[PDB]
RNA sequence: CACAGGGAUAACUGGCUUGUGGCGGCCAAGCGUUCAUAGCGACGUCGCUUUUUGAUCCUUCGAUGUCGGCUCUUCCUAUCAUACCGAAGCAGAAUUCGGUAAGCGUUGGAUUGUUCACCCACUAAUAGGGAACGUGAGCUGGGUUUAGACCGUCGUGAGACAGGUUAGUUUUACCCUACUGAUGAACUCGUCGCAAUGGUAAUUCAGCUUAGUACGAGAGGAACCGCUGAUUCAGAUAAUUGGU
RNA sequence: AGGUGUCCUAAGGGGGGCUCAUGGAGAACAGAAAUCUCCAGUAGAACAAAAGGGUAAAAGUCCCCUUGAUUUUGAUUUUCA
RNA sequence: AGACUAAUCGAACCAUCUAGUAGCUGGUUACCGCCGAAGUUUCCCUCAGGAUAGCAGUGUCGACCUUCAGUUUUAUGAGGUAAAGCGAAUGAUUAGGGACUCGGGGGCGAUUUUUAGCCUUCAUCCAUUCUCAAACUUUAAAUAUGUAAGAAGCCCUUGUUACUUAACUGAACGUGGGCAUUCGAAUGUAUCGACACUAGUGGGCCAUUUUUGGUAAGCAGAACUGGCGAUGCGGGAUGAACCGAACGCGGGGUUAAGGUGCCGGAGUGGACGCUCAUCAGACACCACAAAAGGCGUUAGUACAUCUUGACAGCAGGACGGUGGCCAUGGAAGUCGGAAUCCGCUAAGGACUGUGUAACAACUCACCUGCCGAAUGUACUAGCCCUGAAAAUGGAUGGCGCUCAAGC
């Protein structure tokens, strides 16, 4: 959907035997903070022996892009579930912000591999600082020197209510 | 007899082993379970491969021997009689019944139809789960390709879907390859017949020293 | 299909593991009065005065006392109505119940705690209340810096 | 020919149709089943305590 | 032999299932002069069909006429023959495996009520099935399945036998639709024409020549064109011959 | 997968002393197996019968005395209206 | 011949008893209003039928009794299922090692053998190892289940008795007195208690989870709850049981399940991808398809090679010891048997083939010249294709649809 990145911090409920427990922080992509908390308890239940009934939420914040007007390359590590077994991939994207790459990745995996949102885990997202660390061949062509190309055969836009045109259109816009 | 295997594929009844309540079950088809040089030391064969199931189904006793023979022949021809050790780790203990409609209820009519339809023993089958190990092979490191091909050839005799996994342990021991190597250097491993035993430092001091002379320096 | 007096009691009436043999002798030194709250628990060793298997686990009220047995009143649920049942049980099977001890403890404390306040002159708020939602507080991160977590990649164990 | 053997499909709903009625508890339970030896003496005890309390108007004044 | 009822319950069709019956795949130990796959395939394993037989009892007991043959139309392809092709442990001849293909054919007799089967003879070939196990107001009535009678085994007896044998009534269309043909109101009565849509048709063999040629040590032994006839089917006609 | 139309003057009641199945080492005839002796032994033995539960100074085993397997009627539990 | 006895015969015809009996078929006559079921328990020569309890209606009385509850919280009891276990008892089961000979079998040093000699094959014992149990177990859930939460309560003092105690020591029932300023968890109370009389019903069926016999079934049999029967309305084209939602007569507004190219009320609406099928595909219950394959296309995992320049293509070379030791009418790399070193270099092997009576010639291997950035092998899963054969003409509902009107 339309996502944005959060940070959420949790803690085990303090007890007389263990005052001042440890603090854990995660980065979660979610449409809103109501489901942002829900994903935090899901990932934590697989790493430590803490539940929601015996825990609490300390703080939830919103992380915004530092430079949302600069073009940069991204790389994503992820795992998912197929119809038989689990797998690991690593894909790359080109855009202006961190949030949209997760949006683009979710739509891409749903089409090419029929993978739903229920069965995808995001491990790490990192912005590629240099130009020699681009691996996949569908992105080197987008960073070639002096890129330029025409746009042949583009259909003109005509109002959907104006039927019965009076002359033949042209496709040389 | 020997109805097609399609008719007894799904685990649909509680386990029905042979006991003092059912009598006269036929003798199962598979007898031998270990083949090859089944007395080599642990240090000789450090590579292990498995054939792991991926469905919750039933495997017939007849199919188990067919796969054992097929894999044994390929390994002997290309790796030698003394270059491997093969073990089958699935034992059939479940008895499947049959209702002989024409043998029991034909010619002389007696009683026909569904009246009194409890059947008689007909064979033995094995129950498997998801992720259960079926066949294991250990050999040298230079025979990795041969071991994989032999297992891939023998899955055509089984119904369903199976996978091939190369284990990260040392032989048949439940220890990581790196971990076992360093523990042996500490003297806490003693040789036995085709297996090993480990030091446990929770007994009287007298015979712990002779059994493990290199542990104490 | 048969229905005997002790049918289906293979595990209910049996003694536990490592508990066969002599009955602890403090059982016969207890005393009972009418109106007490007792609960039934059948002992396998004693073969006299055993109630039916339905009452194994129910709680009742004593209504009669005799030389070596007590009479208990329990309520049985037949379809669409309740019925009063009266049974005779040997003392090896009955046992005093802690069901009402919390109530008897609380009434005694309340009476004394109300008396002292009335002399002093302050409201008590004696009656209990359920758990309430937590209140606001502050947590410091001095020498308790949080650690970041992440999901782990797939790996084969066996 | 053959027919259904037994069922319990609609019995629970039928019972709750107009409540599961619990008999009312009451102050003075009956003394049926109590051993007779204690029952005989208890009769004599109550006979005396009525006469003594009746004499409270021209008598003991305890 | 009778009565009150039952599709709450059997014998026939139809419906779900496919164990048994039939048909088709996958893996490759081996057979195959030597060589797993020219042609086959053990131990195992995945499917399809409803012309076999079972299991079930949903629809009909104020009734759906229950075996076989005769006659006649149409459809399916898992292809016996015919057209054109791909493979071989295919020299020729003769054969075996597979593809596109249902346009066109698939017979005459001895015994049996038979379905099924088995022999003689012709032929390019004498392939397998469906349509309420097609088809009784279309026929026939040999079989089964009322009442007469005989034998064998069983029963003290009346009587029984999916054991053998002989004789035994087959009703109605003029109604609606469907089909094959024939007239026909309205815009004056006529003559000469165009063609939307529906139907559609041909089939196989032999003789002469090619040639005792190609091929082969020999034994054996083809084909294209060309010429002339014949089998099954279809539409007309009556000069001659035959029937009435 | 099995059982019942029975059996008991004790195989019912009270009391007392003792501890079983099995294994190890020993002794003329004596051996795998006959009788005697020592040590270990949680029930792995026994308790009329099918199976389940229960029992060790006993509910097993032997010994001593007996007929509560007797008289008059009520309340309560299981199948259940 | 069970034949004939007035169209009647395995017992004629006429009137009466007679309106003979039926647990079995068929029928049972005006309107409106309110409430509203059962196919289950026990007994019966009972199984197409009755009695009995249940569900239902009507008539009321006692108070408006402040009592109650298909519910939650708090305190405290019971259980042997799912899972788990067998280096823990009973039962089943695969494989080696150590210790033992007098337990059995076959040998050796003279099968000498009463030689605890040397061998060994089973058996035995001990420390380990691979798999199981509806009628096995040391342990042990979730869901459901019993009781209690006070005024009929708590405490003090002391009267009765034929019971009990050595004993006014106990036991029940009592008189008197003390304790609310707050009668001692939440929420609701659109429904409190008792009695009288009686109708219909006692053939049921379907679905989620659990589950028994059977190869399976629109097949037979059970547990908790929701439905049809007894019920319309909007969607699934159609369809007692599926999804939404339950109904007096009308007007305006807003939605649910499902839909917006036309039939058809409302988008040829927006964003990123995948697919070309001479059998495409098109929405749960639901009207079907598998094992095994593809150098069709897309995305991914691991290893190996490369600007010190590979992969493809073309072009140049392709040497000695030495015809090695052997074999021999003849074999010089190339019938055959057995080994595989060194010179020179960037590279050419006592060689992978062709070939000579035997040499030769020739090929391969290997290196070099040209070029300009990628290349090789093995695996995973998306759409598509092969596998894919039935009978009147035919059905994603129809027409039709290709940067879709498909996913």
Coordinates of C-alpha atoms (C1' of nucleotides) in Angstrom, one line a residue, chain G residues 93-301:
Chain G
rU93 C1' 13.2 -53.8 16.6
rU94 C1' 18.6 -52.6 13.0
rA95 C1' 24.0 -52.7 13.7
rG96 C1' 29.0 -53.1 15.3
rG97 C1' 32.8 -53.3 20.1
rG98 C1' 34.8 -55.3 25.0
rA99 C1' 34.7 -59.5 28.3
rC100 C1' 34.2 -64.4 28.7
rU101 C1' 34.1 -71.8 27.7
rC102 C1' 32.9 -75.3 29.1
rG103 C1' 26.3 -73.4 27.1
rG104 C1' 26.0 -75.6 21.9
rG105 C1' 29.0 -76.4 16.6
rG106 C1' 32.9 -77.1 13.3
rG107 C1' 38.8 -77.2 13.3
rC108 C1' 44.2 -76.8 14.4
rG109 C1' 49.3 -78.3 17.3
rA110 C1' 49.4 -86.0 17.9
rU111 C1' 40.7 -85.1 15.1
rU112 C1' 46.3 -86.8 21.1
rU113 C1' 42.8 -84.5 24.8
rU114 C1' 39.8 -83.1 31.2
rU115 C1' 45.2 -79.1 26.4
rA116 C1' 40.6 -72.8 31.3
rG117 C1' 46.4 -74.3 24.6
rC118 C1' 45.7 -72.1 19.7
rC119 C1' 41.1 -70.7 16.0
rU120 C1' 36.4 -69.3 15.2
rU121 C1' 30.2 -69.5 14.7
rC122 C1' 26.0 -69.0 17.6
rA123 C1' 24.4 -68.2 22.8
rU124 C1' 25.4 -65.0 27.4
rC125 C1' 26.8 -60.4 30.1
rC126 C1' 28.4 -55.0 30.0
rA127 C1' 29.0 -49.7 27.9
rU128 C1' 26.8 -47.3 23.1
rU129 C1' 23.5 -47.0 18.4
rC130 C1' 18.7 -46.7 14.1
rU131 C1' 13.0 -46.7 14.2
rC132 C1' 7.4 -47.7 16.9
rA133 C1' 2.4 -48.7 20.2
rA134 C1' -6.5 -47.6 20.0
rA135 C1' -6.5 -52.1 24.1
rC136 C1' 2.1 -49.1 26.9
rU137 C1' 4.1 -45.3 30.3
rU138 C1' 8.1 -41.8 34.5
rU139 C1' 5.9 -36.5 32.7
rA140 C1' 1.8 -33.4 30.7
rA141 C1' -1.4 -28.8 27.8
rA142 C1' -5.5 -25.7 25.1
rU143 C1' -11.0 -25.9 25.3
rA144 C1' -14.5 -27.3 28.8
rU145 C1' -15.8 -28.5 34.8
rG146 C1' -17.2 -28.5 41.1
rU147 C1' -17.5 -24.7 45.3
rA148 C1' -17.3 -19.7 47.6
rA149 C1' -17.6 -13.9 47.4
rG150 C1' -21.8 -12.5 54.3
rA151 C1' -27.3 -9.5 58.1
rA152 C1' -30.1 -16.5 57.3
rG153 C1' -23.2 -12.4 58.8
rC154 C1' -19.1 -12.2 62.9
rC155 C1' -18.0 -12.0 68.3
rC156 C1' -19.0 -12.3 73.8
rU157 C1' -21.7 -14.1 78.1
rU158 C1' -24.7 -18.3 79.9
rG159 C1' -30.1 -21.8 80.1
rU160 C1' -32.0 -27.2 78.6
rU161 C1' -31.0 -32.9 77.9
rA162 C1' -32.9 -39.6 78.8
rC163 C1' -26.6 -38.3 74.0
rU164 C1' -21.3 -38.2 75.1
rU165 C1' -16.9 -37.3 78.7
rA166 C1' -12.9 -39.1 84.8
rA167 C1' -15.4 -34.2 84.8
rC168 C1' -21.0 -28.6 83.0
rU169 C1' -15.7 -31.3 79.6
rG170 C1' -18.5 -31.5 74.5
rA171 C1' -22.6 -31.4 71.1
rA172 C1' -27.0 -29.4 68.6
rC173 C1' -31.1 -25.8 69.6
rG174 C1' -31.6 -21.2 72.7
rU175 C1' -31.9 -15.9 76.2
rG176 C1' -29.1 -11.4 76.6
rG177 C1' -25.3 -8.1 74.4
rG178 C1' -21.8 -5.9 70.8
rC179 C1' -20.5 -4.7 65.1
rA180 C1' -23.3 0.0 59.1
rU181 C1' -20.5 6.8 58.7
rU182 C1' -19.2 2.1 54.0
rC183 C1' -24.5 -4.8 53.9
rG184 C1' -18.3 -5.8 51.9
rA185 C1' -15.8 -7.8 42.9
rA186 C1' -17.7 -6.2 37.4
rU187 C1' -22.0 -5.6 33.9
rG188 C1' -27.2 -6.3 33.0
rU189 C1' -32.1 -6.9 35.1
rA190 C1' -36.8 -5.2 27.2
rU191 C1' -39.0 -9.7 32.1
rC192 C1' -39.7 -12.9 39.8
rG193 C1' -41.9 -17.4 42.0
rA194 C1' -45.9 -21.2 42.3
rC195 C1' -50.2 -24.1 40.6
rA196 C1' -54.2 -26.0 37.3
rC197 C1' -56.0 -28.1 32.3
rU198 C1' -54.7 -29.6 27.4
rA199 C1' -53.1 -29.7 21.5
rG200 C1' -49.5 -31.4 18.0
rU201 C1' -44.8 -34.5 17.7
rG202 C1' -42.1 -39.5 18.7
rG203 C1' -39.8 -41.5 9.6
rG204 C1' -35.8 -36.2 9.7
rC205 C1' -31.9 -34.0 6.4
rC206 C1' -27.4 -30.6 5.4
rA207 C1' -22.6 -27.8 6.8
rU208 C1' -17.3 -26.1 9.9
rU209 C1' -13.9 -28.9 13.5
rU210 C1' -13.2 -34.0 15.9
rU211 C1' -14.2 -39.0 14.3
rU212 C1' -15.5 -45.2 13.3
rG213 C1' -16.2 -49.5 9.1
rG214 C1' -15.0 -49.2 3.6
rU215 C1' -10.4 -48.9 -2.5
rA216 C1' -14.3 -45.2 -2.8
rA217 C1' -19.5 -43.1 -3.0
rG218 C1' -24.8 -37.6 -3.9
rC219 C1' -22.7 -44.7 1.0
rA220 C1' -23.4 -46.4 6.5
rG221 C1' -22.7 -44.7 12.0
rA222 C1' -21.4 -40.8 16.3
rA223 C1' -19.8 -35.6 19.7
rC224 C1' -20.4 -29.6 20.5
rU225 C1' -22.8 -25.6 17.9
rG226 C1' -25.4 -23.1 13.6
rG227 C1' -29.2 -24.0 9.6
rC228 C1' -33.5 -26.3 6.0
rG229 C1' -38.0 -28.5 7.3
rA230 C1' -41.8 -24.0 9.2
rU231 C1' -39.1 -18.4 5.1
rG232 C1' -39.7 -14.4 1.7
rC233 C1' -35.6 -10.4 0.0
rG234 C1' -30.3 -8.8 -2.5
rG235 C1' -25.8 -11.7 -4.8
rG236 C1' -23.6 -17.3 -6.9
rA237 C1' -26.6 -17.0 -15.0
rU238 C1' -29.9 -21.5 -13.1
rG239 C1' -30.1 -24.4 -8.0
rA240 C1' -34.6 -26.5 0.1
rA241 C1' -29.0 -26.1 3.0
rC242 C1' -23.5 -21.2 0.5
rC243 C1' -22.5 -15.1 1.3
rG244 C1' -25.4 -10.5 3.2
rA245 C1' -29.7 -10.0 6.0
rA246 C1' -34.8 -12.0 8.4
rC247 C1' -40.6 -9.1 6.5
rG248 C1' -47.2 -4.0 8.9
rC249 C1' -48.7 0.4 4.5
rG250 C1' -45.7 4.8 2.1
rG251 C1' -41.9 9.1 1.2
rG252 C1' -36.5 11.0 1.3
rG253 C1' -31.2 9.7 2.6
rU254 C1' -26.9 5.9 3.3
rU255 C1' -24.8 0.9 2.8
rA256 C1' -23.6 -4.9 3.0
rA257 C1' -22.3 -9.5 -0.1
rG258 C1' -21.5 -8.6 -5.3
rG259 C1' -20.4 -5.3 -9.5
rU260 C1' -19.1 -0.8 -13.5
rG261 C1' -17.0 -2.7 -22.7
rC262 C1' -22.7 -4.3 -24.5
rC263 C1' -27.2 -7.2 -23.2
rG264 C1' -27.3 -4.2 -17.5
rG265 C1' -28.1 0.7 -13.2
rA266 C1' -22.4 2.5 -12.5
rG267 C1' -14.9 3.7 -15.3
rU268 C1' -13.1 1.4 -22.6
rG269 C1' -10.7 4.9 -14.6
rG270 C1' -5.1 5.5 -12.3
rA271 C1' 0.1 2.9 -10.9
rC272 C1' 4.1 -1.4 -11.6
rG273 C1' 4.8 -6.2 -13.9
rC274 C1' 3.8 -11.4 -16.3
rU275 C1' 1.6 -14.2 -20.8
rC276 C1' 1.2 -15.3 -27.9
rA277 C1' -1.5 -21.0 -26.8
rU278 C1' -3.0 -24.6 -35.3
rC279 C1' -6.8 -27.3 -27.0
rA280 C1' -4.8 -19.7 -24.5
rG281 C1' -7.3 -17.8 -20.1
rA282 C1' -11.3 -15.7 -17.2
rC283 C1' -13.4 -15.9 -9.2
rA284 C1' -14.8 -19.7 -2.8
rC285 C1' -18.8 -24.1 -1.8
rC286 C1' -18.8 -25.9 -7.8
rA287 C1' -19.4 -29.1 -11.5
rC288 C1' -12.4 -32.0 -12.2
rA289 C1' -7.1 -33.7 -13.9
rA290 C1' -1.5 -36.5 -12.3
rA291 C1' 3.8 -38.6 -12.4
rA292 C1' 7.5 -37.1 -15.9
rG293 C1' 9.7 -33.4 -19.5
rG294 C1' 11.0 -28.2 -22.7
rC295 C1' 18.0 -24.3 -25.3
rG296 C1' 9.6 -20.6 -24.9
rU297 C1' 10.2 -16.5 -21.7
rU298 C1' 11.2 -14.1 -16.8
rA299 C1' 13.4 -13.8 -12.0
rG300 C1' 16.9 -16.2 -8.4
rU301 C1' 21.3 -19.6 -5.6

